[PDB]
C-alpha cells in the first residue's frame, strides 16, 4: 500500500550478535545489466550457523536492474521454516541508516527516476512471491545506500541454524 511505518527500527546484524567485520561479504552475481542477490543456498541451516551473508550490490553505471531472491517459508521443508523479510513492502519501501540504526524509507523519494514494475513474471513484485526487482535511473547525483533483510537465522534443525541475509545497495554517482 506504500505507507512507511516511522516507528520501525532494526540493525544490519538483527539478533545474530555478529559484528560487520565477521559478516560473509560478497558481490552480487552480475550478468549484463542485471545484479542478482540469490539467498536460496546462502541461508540454508548449517552446523556453523548463524552467519551473516551480506550481498553487496555496487552500482556505478546506468539502468542497472537489481533482483533479490529470498526463499519462501515451506518452499523446501525444514530449511526456511522461520525465515522473515524486511521491509514487507520491498521494493517500494527500503531500509536506510539513520544515525546507526535501519529505518524505513520510500525508495522513489531516495532515488529520482526509479522503475518498479508492479509485477515480476506475472506475479506481484513483493517478497511474498519470493523475488523483487527494480531498475535504477540513467543518472544518480549523490552516493545512496539502502538495505533489504532476508533473515533465516531463527530456523533451527537440531544443531544446524540458518543465516541472516543482508542486501546493501551502494549506488555511486554516475551518468556524466
Amino acid at each position: 500500500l506504500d505507507k512507511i511505518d516511522l516507528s520501525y527500527e532494526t540493525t544490519e546484524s538483527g539478533d545474530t550478535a555478529v559484528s560487520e567485520d565477521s559478516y560473509d561479504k560478497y558481490a552480487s552475481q552480475n550478468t549484463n545489466k542485471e545484479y542478482v542477490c540469490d539467498f536460496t543456498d546462502q541461508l540454508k541451516p548449517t552446523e556453523s550457523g548463524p552467519k551473516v551473508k551480506k550481498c553487496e550490490v555496487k552500482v556505478n553505471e546506468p539502468l542497472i536492474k537489481v533482483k533479490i531472491i529470498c526463499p519462501l517459508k515451506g518452499s523446501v521443508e525444514k530449511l526456511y521454516d522461520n525465515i522473515e523479510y524486511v521491509p514487507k513492502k520491498s521494493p517500494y519501501v527500503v531500509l536506510t541508516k539513520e544515525e546507526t540504526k535501519l529505518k524505513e524509507k520510500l525508495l522513489s523519494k531516495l532515488i529520482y527516476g526509479l522503475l518498479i514494475s508492479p509485477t515480476v513474471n506475472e506475479k506481484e513484485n513483493n517478497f511474498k512471491e519470493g523475488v523483487i526487482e527494480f531498475t535504477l535511473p540513467p543518472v544518480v547525483h549523490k552516493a545512496t545506500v539502502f538495505y533489504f533483510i532476508c533473515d533465516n537465522s531463527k530456523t533451527e534443525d537440531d544443531n544446524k541454524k540458518g543465516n541472516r541475509g543482508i542486501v546493501e545497495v551502494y549506488v555511486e554517482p554516475y551518468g556524466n
Partner: single-chain antibody
C-alpha cells in the same frame, strides 16, 4: 580484527584549532558511523558527533555550536575531528569509535590527549555515584532515561587511562567475551547492570549510554572500587 588508530597527543595554545585523525583498518569504512566522544580529565564521557563517510556530512552536538567539524577520507579509511577556539575546558582525551551493524559503538581508538596550554535531549541519571564493595559481593548500577529509549541502552566499563569497553547493549545483550556474572535489565526508562559476584578485574568506572537518538547521552558514571 578491526583496529582504530588515532593521531598522537598534542599541546595546543588557547584559540587554536586541533584536527585529530582516526585510521580504520579491517571491516568496512564507507557505510558505518565513525563517532567522536571526549573525556576531560577525571570527568565523564561526552558525545561530540558522528559521520557515515559516504554521506560527506557529519552530525554534531548543539553544545559545540559549530566549533566541531567531522570529515572522512574514504580513499585512506581515515576520519577527522577538528575542534576550533580551544580553551582550558577542551583539555581532554578525544576518542573515535565505530558501530559494526549492532547500532552501538563497539570498536574504540586508544584516544588522543589534547592539552590546551598558554532542548529535547535525553538525560541519563546514573546512581549510585560511587560504590565501595569487597570481592564476592553483588554490585547493582541504576540508569534512568528522561524519555523512553525502548531497549537502546549500552553499559561501558572504563579502567584508568583506557578507552571505554562495551559490556552490554540493547539493555540485556552481553558483548562477546563478557563473563556471565554481568547481566543487564530494563526497558523504557529504568535500567540496571548487575555483577553477581565481584572479581578483581571488575573495579572500574561504569557508564550507561542511550543510543535511541542523537545527541547520544551518558550517565555521569559509577566508580566501583575495593572497600578500604
Amino acid at each position: 580484527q578491526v583496529q582504530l588508530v588515532q593521531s598522537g597527543a598534542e599541546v595546543k595554545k588557547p584559540g587554536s584549532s586541533v584536527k585529530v585523525s582516526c585510521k580504520v583498518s579491517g571491516g568496512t569504512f564507507n557505510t558505518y558511523a565513525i563517532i567522536w566522544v571526549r573525556q576531560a580529565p577525571g570527568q565523564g564521557l561526552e558525545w561530540m558527533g558522528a559521520i557515515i563517510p559516504f554521506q560527506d556530512r557529519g552530525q554534531y552536538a548543539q553544545k559545540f555550536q559549530g566549533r566541531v567539524t567531522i570529515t572522512a577520507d574514504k580513499s585512506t579509511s581515515t576520519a577527522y575531528m577538528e575542534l576550533s577556539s580551544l580553551r582550558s575546558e577542551d583539555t581532554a582525551v578525544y576518542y573515535c569509535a565505530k558501530e559494526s551493524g549492532r547500532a552501538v559503538a563497539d570498536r574504540w581508538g586508544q584516544g588522543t590527549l589534547v592539552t590546551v596550554s598558554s532542548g529535547s535531549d535525553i538525560v541519563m541519571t546514573q546512581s549510585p555515584a560511587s560504590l565501595a564493595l569487597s570481592l564476592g559481593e553483588r554490585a547493582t548500577l541504576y540508569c534512568r532515561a528522561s524519555h523512553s529509549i525502548s531497549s537502546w541502552l549500552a553499559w561501558y566499563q572504563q579502567k584508568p587511562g583506557k578507552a571505554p569497553k562495551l559490556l552490554i547493549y540493547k539493555a540485556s545483550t552481553l558483548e562477546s567475551g563478557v563473563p556471565s556474572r554481568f547481566s543487564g535489565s530494563g526497558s523504557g526508562t529504568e535500567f540496571t547492570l548487575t555483577i553477581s559476584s565481584l572479581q578483581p578485574d571488575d573495579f572500574a568506572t561504569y557508564y550507561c549510554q542511550q543510543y535511541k537518538s542523537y545527541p547520544w547521552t551518558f550517565g555521569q558514571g559509577t566508580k566501583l572500587e575495593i572497600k578500604r
